[PDB]
RNA sequence: AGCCCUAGCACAGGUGCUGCAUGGCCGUCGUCAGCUCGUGCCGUGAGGUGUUGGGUUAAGUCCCGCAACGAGCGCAACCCCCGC
C-alpha cells in the first residue's frame, strides 16, 4: 500500500534553495517550487527497504535522528516502535565519535534510576535534593532515546541531511551505513541509501518512517495497526 | 677503662661572600574569576573549539543556547567567632 499515499501531500517541497547535486532525483519546477518525482522514489524506496529488511533480521541496530519539529515526536514514536535508538532534543557532538565519552553520561544516568527509589528518595542534603533530581532532567531530557545504543550502530536513519549533516559526517568517518529521509537542500552524494522525500511536511515523515519500522517488525512477526502515530493534524 | 690537664694529628669555628647556585617560608598582582586537562571536532601548522554568545551572579554563580561531552587547580560549601 504505497503508490498513491506519499502522492497525498508529500511529493515535492522546498523550492530554489536546492543543491543541483539533486537535479536527477526531480520532475519539475511548477509554480516555482520544486516537485520530486516519485516514481524514483520508489525506485530507491525499495532499495532502501532492502536494505532494512537485510540488516533488520540479521537483528541489527539503526539509530534514528529527527529534530525538526514536524519530526521530534515522530520519531520517538516509531523509533520506541520498534526498540530502536533515537536522538530527538539535539544531537550532541561525539554521539558517535566520542561514543565512549558521551556514553559516560548514560553510565552516569541510570545511576538514578537507582536513587530514584532507593533509602535516597527523601533525604541527603536537600539542596541536593532537586538539583540532583533536576540533574536527570537534562539527562532524560536528551538521552531518551539515546540510552539504549550500548554498541555503536550499524545504520543511522536521519529525517534531515542538511540539518543533521553533523551527525552524517560523524557517520560516514565510522564508515556507518546513512539512511535518510531527504530532499533538495541535501547533498544525496553521501546518503547512502537515499529516500528521496519531504524533510518537512509531518504526514510524509509519518507515512514514510513508520512504514519503515513496519518492515523492522515483520522482519521479527507481528505488525499491528496504523501505529500509535496521527499527529495534532491541524 | 671513663674523664679531665700539656705537646702534636685528623677536624671544629666563621652573622665572612654569593638570595643571580638553592630548600624552606613570606610579600605581590589578588580573594582578582580566573588558569587548565581528557576525548572528540577544526586547522599543513603554531593553535583553535570546550572557556565564545544571550540572561544572571559577589564569582568560569547558575540558567538558556552551542561540535562538543565532561573533568581538575579555582569560586562556593564542609571549620571558627557573633546574632534567636
Do not use: C
Not at 18 to 33: D, H, L, Q, T, V
Not at 67 to 74: F, L, S
Not at 229 to 234: F, G, I, P, T
Amino acid at each position: 500500500v504505497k503508490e498513491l499515499l506519499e502522492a497525498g501531500v508529500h511529493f515535492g517541497h522546498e523550492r530554489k534553495r536546492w543543491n543541483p547535486k539533486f537535479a536527477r532525483y526531480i520532475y519539475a519546477e511548477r509554480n516555482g517550487i520544486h516537485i520530486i518525482d516519485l516514481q524514483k522514489t520508489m525506485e530507491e524506496l525499495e532499495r532502501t527497504f532492502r536494505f532494512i529488511e537485510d540488516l533488520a533480521m540479521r537483528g541489527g541496530t539503526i539509530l534514528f535522528v529527527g529534530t525538526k519539529k514536524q519530526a521530534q515526536d515522530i520519531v520517538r514514536m516509531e523509533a520506541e516502535r520498534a526498540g530502536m535508538p533515537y536522538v530527538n532534543q539535539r544531537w550532541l557532538g561525539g554521539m558517535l565519535t566520542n561514543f565512549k565519552t558521551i556514553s559516560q553520561r548514560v553510565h552516569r544516568l541510570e545511576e538514578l534510576e537507582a536513587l530514584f527509589a532507593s533509602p535516597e528518595i527523601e533525604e541527603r542534603p536537600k539542596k541536593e535534593q532537586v538539583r540532583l533530581k533536576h540533574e536527570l532532567e537534562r539527562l532524560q531530557k536528551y538521552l531518551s532515546g539515546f540510552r539504549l545504543l550500548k554498541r555503536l550502530p550499524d545504520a543511522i536513519f536521519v529525517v534531515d541531511p542538511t540539518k543533521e549533516a553533523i551527525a552524517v559526517r560523524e557517520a560516514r568517518k565510522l564508515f556507518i551505513p546513512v539512511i535518510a529521509l531527504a530532499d533538495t537542500d541535501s547533498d544525496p552524494d553521501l546518503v547512502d541509501y537515499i529516500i528521496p522525500g519531504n524533510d518537512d511536511a509531518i504526514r510524509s515523515i509519518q507515512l514514510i518512517l513508520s512504514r519503515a519500522v513496519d518492515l523492522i517488525i515483520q522482519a521479527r512477526g507481528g505488525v499491528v495497526e496504523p501505529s500509535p502515530s496521527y499527529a495534532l493534524v491541524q
